[PDB]
Write an enzyme that holds these catalytic residues in place. Structure first.
Site, mmCIF file in Angstrom:
data_model
loop_
_atom_site.group_PDB
_atom_site.id
_atom_site.type_symbol
_atom_site.label_atom_id
_atom_site.label_comp_id
_atom_site.label_asym_id
_atom_site.label_seq_id
_atom_site.Cartn_x
_atom_site.Cartn_y
_atom_site.Cartn_z
ATOM 1 N N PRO A 26 -89.849 35.986 42.838
ATOM 2 C CA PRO A 26 -89.799 36.578 44.177
ATOM 3 C C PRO A 26 -91.014 37.493 44.336
ATOM 4 O O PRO A 26 -91.263 38.346 43.491
ATOM 5 C CB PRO A 26 -88.474 37.339 44.169
ATOM 6 N N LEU A 27 -91.775 37.305 45.405
ATOM 7 C CA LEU A 27 -92.970 38.110 45.616
ATOM 8 C C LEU A 27 -93.092 38.652 47.032
ATOM 9 O O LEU A 27 -93.365 37.908 47.972
ATOM 10 C CB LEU A 27 -94.213 37.278 45.277
ATOM 11 N N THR A 28 -92.886 39.957 47.170
ATOM 12 C CA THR A 28 -93.001 40.638 48.455
ATOM 13 C C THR A 28 -94.447 40.523 48.937
ATOM 14 O O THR A 28 -95.363 40.984 48.258
ATOM 15 C CB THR A 28 -92.642 42.130 48.302
ATOM 16 N N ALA A 61 -88.059 39.499 48.181
ATOM 17 C CA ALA A 61 -86.983 40.436 48.476
ATOM 18 C C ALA A 61 -86.788 40.533 49.981
ATOM 19 O O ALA A 61 -87.724 40.830 50.718
ATOM 20 C CB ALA A 61 -87.321 41.808 47.908
ATOM 21 N N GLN A 103 -83.927 36.107 47.684
ATOM 22 C CA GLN A 103 -83.593 37.322 46.950
ATOM 23 C C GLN A 103 -83.117 38.355 47.964
ATOM 24 O O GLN A 103 -83.780 38.583 48.978
ATOM 25 C CB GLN A 103 -84.801 37.875 46.188
ATOM 26 N N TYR A 200 -84.589 49.462 42.559
ATOM 27 C CA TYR A 200 -83.952 49.454 43.862
ATOM 28 C C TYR A 200 -82.469 49.786 43.712
ATOM 29 O O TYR A 200 -82.010 50.056 42.603
ATOM 30 C CB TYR A 200 -84.244 48.125 44.553
ATOM 31 N N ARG A 249 -80.987 39.152 39.213
ATOM 32 C CA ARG A 249 -82.198 39.601 38.535
ATOM 33 C C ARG A 249 -82.073 41.042 38.044
ATOM 34 O O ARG A 249 -81.551 41.904 38.752
ATOM 35 C CB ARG A 249 -83.432 39.488 39.445
ATOM 36 N N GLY A 336 -95.178 35.090 38.615
ATOM 37 C CA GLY A 336 -95.451 35.812 39.843
ATOM 38 C C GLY A 336 -96.907 35.679 40.257
ATOM 39 O O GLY A 336 -97.240 34.922 41.169
#
Ligand SMILES: Cc1cc2nc3c(=O)[nH]c(=O)nc-3n(C[C@H](O)[C@H](O)[C@H](O)COP(=O)(O)O)c2cc1C
Length: 379
Positions: A26-28, A61, A103, A200, A249, A336
């Site tokens: 997952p990559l913001t 995310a 995510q 988080y 995760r 990633g």
């Protein structure tokens, strides 16, 4: 495909079968609208479809609570408008034969004060306009990155309110559940990944440094109670969409935001055995520290306490991922940085081709630069 044969093996994951074990982490990327957090389909659809050859794509995310932003312009999955755009993006990935999980995140004490505290604070919307966390302990000696800050320059994190047990049970958990329903039933995602890592909300209840709650089912006083929120959120989401469409995760050694637990090994093994009854699609974990301070053999901890699908992550290359899968230490590896820079990462692995070097300073431009401008091999 002779160089990394194990990495290219198919994999049963939940109710699916991956074409390979090269997973996109997952990559913001902050390519959603700032005010409404609606995916900017024009750029995001291309980005994800261009990487659809991945065994599994874990989408960045995405917010479950309205306006509770931590990255300023990340996507949400709570509104109809967001759902529609995600639906189109997901369909694009599916047209390429790919698989994609969304995510789900709640930034907790990492929420952006200047944005969240500006929202209205009504009684019909009790959680709105408030910073929320496990304990009223602000992130220290760490400021909001310029690329996430509302002003575009480093800003200070705020002191969050200490969520009551009722707010967690009847407020927070339901949002994750609804987000999962929206993602899977309305947008068509193949599944969802619970974000219980990187400082988080869920990770904040998980590790000692951020959870000092004195009582209740989520008390920071014991390992079991600290593991409870992650379990409860995951369990309730499983109840709604099926455990074979739910992943989780964690990052037991990731020191971002000053996160740290005095006994990561015992904590990790305890969580693994606690979620063992859920038959999740997979457990995804960072095996180390993003800030290079904390050390521990997370791969071994998980391998010896969890019988499900294990997806490892952090500073892996094709060779190492292939070898760990060969040894049975992990089932798959999520990449990633390499997926940011190589849309055809899988094809490069099959041909043992070289990779594009990443431009780490262009990860959050919010424009085509450093987002959709990485070429496929020889193109
Ligand atoms: C630009 C960028 C955005 C990221 N966004 C997320 C995210 O939304 N959720 C998450 O769990 N991890 C996120 N990560 C962490 C990555 O998933 C991954 O664990 C990290 O890049 C280390 O793996 P690598 O060495 O393969 O790059 C992000 C990392 C980068 C560099």
């Amino acid at each position: 495909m002779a160089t990394f044969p194990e990495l290219l093996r198919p994999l049963k994951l939940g109710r699916y079968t991956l074409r390979n074990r090269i997973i996109m982490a997952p990559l913001t990327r902050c390519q959603a609208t700032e005010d409404d957090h609606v995916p900017r389909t024009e750029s995001m659809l291309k980005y994800y479809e261009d990487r659809a050859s991945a065994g599994l794509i874990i989408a960045e995310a995405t917010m479950v609570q309205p306006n509770y932003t931590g990255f300023l312009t990340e996507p949400g999955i709570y509104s109809d408008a967001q759902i529609e755009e995600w639906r189109k993006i997901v369909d694009a990935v599916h047209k390429k034969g790919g698989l994609i999980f969304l995510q789900l995140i709640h930034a907790g004490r990492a929420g952006i004060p200047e944005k969240i505290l500006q929202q209205s604070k009504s009684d019909q919307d009790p959680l709105a306009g408030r910073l929320l966390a496990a304990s009223a302990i602000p992130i220290k000696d760490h400021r909001i990155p310029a690329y996430f800050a509302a002003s575009g320059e480093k800003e200070t994190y705020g002191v969050p309110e200490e969520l009551t047990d009722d707010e967690v049970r009847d407020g927070i958990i339901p949002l994750f559940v609804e987000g999962a329903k929206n993602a899977i039933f309305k947008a068509g995602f193949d599944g969802v990944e619970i974000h219980g890592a990187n400082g988080y909300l869920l990770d904040a209840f998980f590790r000692e440094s951020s959870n000092k709650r004195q009582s209740g089912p989520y008390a920071g006083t014991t390992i079991d109670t600290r593991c409870q929120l992650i379990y409860d959120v995951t369990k309730s989401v499983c109840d709604a969409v099926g455990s074979d469409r739910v992943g989780l995760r964690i990052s037991p050694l990731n020191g971002v935001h000053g996160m740290i637990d005095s006994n990561p090994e015992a904590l990790t093994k305890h969580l693994c055995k606690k979620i063992e009854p859920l038959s999740l699609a997979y457990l995804h974990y960072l095996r180390g520290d993003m800030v290079n301070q904390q050390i521990g053999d997370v791969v071994a901890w998980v391998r010896g306490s969890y019988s499900g699908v294990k997806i490892s992550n952090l500073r892996y290359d094709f060779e190492e991922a292939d070898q760990q899968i060969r040894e049975g230490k992990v089932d798959a590896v999520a990449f990633g940085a390499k997926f940011i820079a190589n849309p055809d990462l899988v094809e490069r692995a099959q041909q043992n081709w070289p990779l594009n070097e990443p431009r780490p300073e262009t990860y959050y431009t919010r424009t085509a630069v450093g987002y959709n401008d990485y070429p496929t091999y020889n193109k």
